[PDB]
Amino acid sequence: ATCYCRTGRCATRESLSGVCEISGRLYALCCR
Amino acid sequence: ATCYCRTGRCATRESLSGVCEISGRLYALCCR
């Protein structure tokens, strides 16, 4: 899948799918 | 990025990047 680790909401064409943890920071997981 | 929601360990070229929550189930987020 194509996915992004986001600092804001997911884009409209993306689905919230979990959490990224990179270098200690949390991100929304947004896939399409 | 290219990401998969895994029930096992990440493949050699993937990095463990977080967790997926899909239909009430936990998975390892594996990204390359």
Ligand SMILES: [Cl-]
């Ligand atoms: Cl973002």
Ligand SMILES: [Cl-]
């Ligand atoms: Cl898997």
Ligand SMILES: [Cl-]
């Ligand atoms: Cl879920």
